[PDB]
Design a protein that fits this description.
The structure is cut from a larger assembly and holds three copies of chain A. Chain A is mainly alpha-helical. The first copy, chain A, has 15 helices and no strands. The longest helix of chain A is centred in the middle third of the chain and has 27 residues. Chain A is globular. Chain A: Belongs to the ryanodine receptor (TC 1.A.3.1) family. RYR1 subfamily.
Chain lengths: ~250, ~900, ~45
Amino acid sequence: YNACSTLPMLCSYLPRWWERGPEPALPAGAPPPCTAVTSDHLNGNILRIIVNNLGIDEATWMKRLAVSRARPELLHSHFIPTIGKRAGKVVAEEEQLRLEAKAEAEEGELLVRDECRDLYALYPLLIRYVDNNRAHWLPNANAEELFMVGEIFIYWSKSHNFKREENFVVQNEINNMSFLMAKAGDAQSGGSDQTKKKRRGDRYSTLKKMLPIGLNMCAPKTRYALKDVREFLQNNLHLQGKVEGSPSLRWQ
Amino acid sequence: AESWKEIVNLLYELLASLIRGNRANCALFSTNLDWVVSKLDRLEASSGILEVLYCVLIESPEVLNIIQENHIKSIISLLDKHGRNHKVLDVLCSLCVCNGVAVRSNQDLITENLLPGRELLLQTNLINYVTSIRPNIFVGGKWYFEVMVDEVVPFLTAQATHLRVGWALTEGYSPYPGGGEGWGGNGVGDDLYSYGFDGLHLWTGHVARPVTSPGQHLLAPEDVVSCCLDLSVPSISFRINGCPVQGVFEAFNLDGLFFPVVSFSAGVKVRFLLGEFKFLPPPGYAPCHEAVLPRERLRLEPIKEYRREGPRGPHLVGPSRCFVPCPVDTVQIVLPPHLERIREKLAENIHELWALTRIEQGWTYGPVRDDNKRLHPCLVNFHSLPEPERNYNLQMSGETLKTLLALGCHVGMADEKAYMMSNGYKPAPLDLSHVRLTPAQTTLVDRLAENGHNVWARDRVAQRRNPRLVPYRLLDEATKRSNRDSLCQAVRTLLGYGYNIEPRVRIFRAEKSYTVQSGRWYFEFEAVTTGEMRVGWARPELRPDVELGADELAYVFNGHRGQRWHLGSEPFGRPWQSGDVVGCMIDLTENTIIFTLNGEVLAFREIEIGDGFLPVCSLGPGQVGHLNLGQDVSSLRFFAICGLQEGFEPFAINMQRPVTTWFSKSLPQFEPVPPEHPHYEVARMDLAHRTWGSQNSLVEMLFLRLSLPVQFTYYYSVRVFACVWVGWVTPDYHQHDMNFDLSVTVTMGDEQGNVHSSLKCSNYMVWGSHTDLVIGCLVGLMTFTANGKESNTFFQVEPNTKLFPAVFVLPTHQNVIQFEAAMFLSERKNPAPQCPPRLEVQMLMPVSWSRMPNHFLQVETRRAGERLGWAVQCQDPLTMMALHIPEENRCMDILELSERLDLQRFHSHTLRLYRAVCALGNN
Amino acid sequence: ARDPVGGSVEFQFVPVLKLVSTLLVMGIFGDEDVKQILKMIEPE
């Protein structure tokens, strides 16, 4: 794949692209050597193939809907890093929602930890390999233009991060690092303040100031809504967990 | 006795301490007023005496009644002894007024002793904004240009409208509108030469020499004022609409290229009948519209320009850069005959290649070199018809490779030597068909083509006024795409031969007021040029005089290459494509700093709060920039990213006002030497004199500018004991290094040239193990006394002007200089004579240095332009609100004192003073 | 807004309101303008 660095020869690669429509994963691991050769193709028309590569990410996302050979798939996520599209981000929002439903299932394993969570800890390392691919997803200029659903999708990515605040399992996840981010996500939390009325908050120094009152909510997320746009109190509920996450940031 | 001055001062302080809280002490001191005044004259520990007097005045009206009409004059004189000490003024206002009542008389004496005296107290007035205009081309033969006056509005606003016109050069004239020089902008430089207003005449040093016009008139929307300048000799003479303004300028340095100038003020327009001539008098001249020779088209410019009128806002800009007559060898070094045969081979190959190009136009060989069609001797083998009918190659191409040994190349042997059916003669060249040159060797081809064109250029003076006369250093890269790349075709045969081919910086800054030490703060730097643009936070205290980079106080990021600088380079970043705005973010409380390329996060993490950081631009000499801070609208690519989110608010959210800033000014206005210069020691002492020395090993030159102008008998003296340019300085001056002497005369003609005498001189002076002394007499005209002995004096000027006595020493490392019929150190002060010497607090030592930060000015000019006529125009004048240091006069807006606040304190006390001077209703 | 309008906002006010005040005292004003002040301050 490092070695990558006749119009009909390109037609054979279109047939190689057809092999991808069929996608047993061990035969596919070697394709990442072929997918890295596609980076040489990027040198334009090859961006349409990268749109096809976006559907490839949606295919690895189906694995995410539900061990060490998955680490070799994380080495294929390393090939993703060379590739590091917005409708595919909505499919990535479906991938993150798949990760949301699954990380909340990992949280149910943590309820078992109350009296065991060690099998979740291997999933915690495998969930970390998913997060490698999120660095490739981090592109964020398009999210600036969203400040909505892209952010609400990031809110879905964000809700999952509340469970990272919850403990000994994460030390087993540190062991994955021994065997071997989220602040850029916080861009999206600010979208709750909204466009030109957000400039008015600076006159107040508009919703972010009421959101700053909400930082006090987490000192005590049903309670954020109790004080009372109730959807904006639900945006404060994202901030309520984020401030108790800021108490976790005291560790940092 | 060395403890003794401290002791005495300590005693005054004691006494003072006894005085501040009581009336009675003062009552006892009422008899001591004459005594106190007797003691104030002392010049070493006067401050305590001052506190004394002060408190006494605070607590004794009677003493105000008593004080004599001259002891007070002794006090004003004290102030003149001490220069700018605010305390004395507090003393004065204390004199003015009692417990409530006042002695009106002594106050009126204060005024007559002050206000007419002008010079002691700082004083102020105002101008209107001044704006010079120039044609784009600098001159370095005789030239001529035309300037019709479309419009004048002489008396709008309090000022008479400015509209001076004259010649100038890029070093002694750098017109920054925000003040400088005694109340103006054009006509001020020794390097600039000028004209205007009543009686025509001129301004140099902003001196109004009143050479009368043949007849007459001012400047009104009529005259086609016009100018000429002979080459070498600066025999400038203005002309009023076809009537020359007599004999004028003569004999001046040609230090750098000369260019035409037209300053203006108010609602005024002027047209250039150039491209349209009207009046072209003979002086060996050639017209200036024809002066569009280089790449640039002819055009007006406003000179220097530190704020171009850009779209979203005024861009920061300048200086860019700027020398031609000189052929520089194409046939020097000999070509060895082993290679000369291949010189004649590759030349015959490229001559036959000359046959494979022009024939496409239908040209054909045979035989006379007719200009018509189908007739050249060149379309054949080069050997056949001597070396003039085939001068296109081996007569000269063989010489061109002699240049390859002469223009800076050391060539070696390395490889074996090497269809239209066209009319006349038909060889198709090989190996020119597969050419592969090394890319620097095309630049070497530029040296070859230029060096060769230069010799033709030297007879070009014997000619229409060819645009070609200038060297390829300044030409289109189209004619250069021909004459240089055609030389590469001779070099294209060499690839077949296979032979080897081995081979003023600017700065800007925010208001100190705005030095936040707390709060969150993003800030913009909108891009223009992608060069050394570098910008970042910095503490105010750093010299803008120092170049940015290696300084503790100024964390910054480059506009190019992309490593950040602090205390030299600290690499981490990357550069940017032009027009990519560079924003940045700073935590406060937390120390971190983070530069961003349009919101692209990566900077100076972990530092400390201090003075309070400010943004600071710093352009390279060629580079151009822009800035805007605050306005929520200023949130394009950049603040819209992390800036909206993290709460890092921009400056102008806080304020209605646009931010004030200071451009650096390459002009070295004098400043007093700080203790801790990198090192120039100085020591005052009693025969009164002072001592000197470089001490540490350290670099070039000392422009030793003593502050004090001579008034219009007295000797003045400066021994030296270790090559050095003695010669008393002109106050308005500037430039750096060498200067022997790179600094001036004017005929006072009556058009005839008979002249009512002719003058102008010292616009300074220069000189070259016996010690060196200087006892020059004055009052009048200058009388030099080189090496103690008399040696004549070329200088002589006394139009009642004030001027400097000083020297530009080059250091001999250790003990650089000594320093000092009746002694001068007295007449300089008001109480002339009082003959005995008296060194004192205002005996200043302000050396000129370099770059300093003058204010940007929030608003100034509204100029509008035009072409196929160049009828430039501008509208409503706005004031140069300003004051000046009365000595060495230099207009400065008062607000400039806000930051060099010591003078603000002095001024403010002047105002307290006057306020006391009113005496509650004195009229 | 911390412009400051001069000398940290408030210091800017003093002298001007001083002028107004004294100038008001001297018989220049109103008529009108002092009425502008009173509408400026109550408001009513």
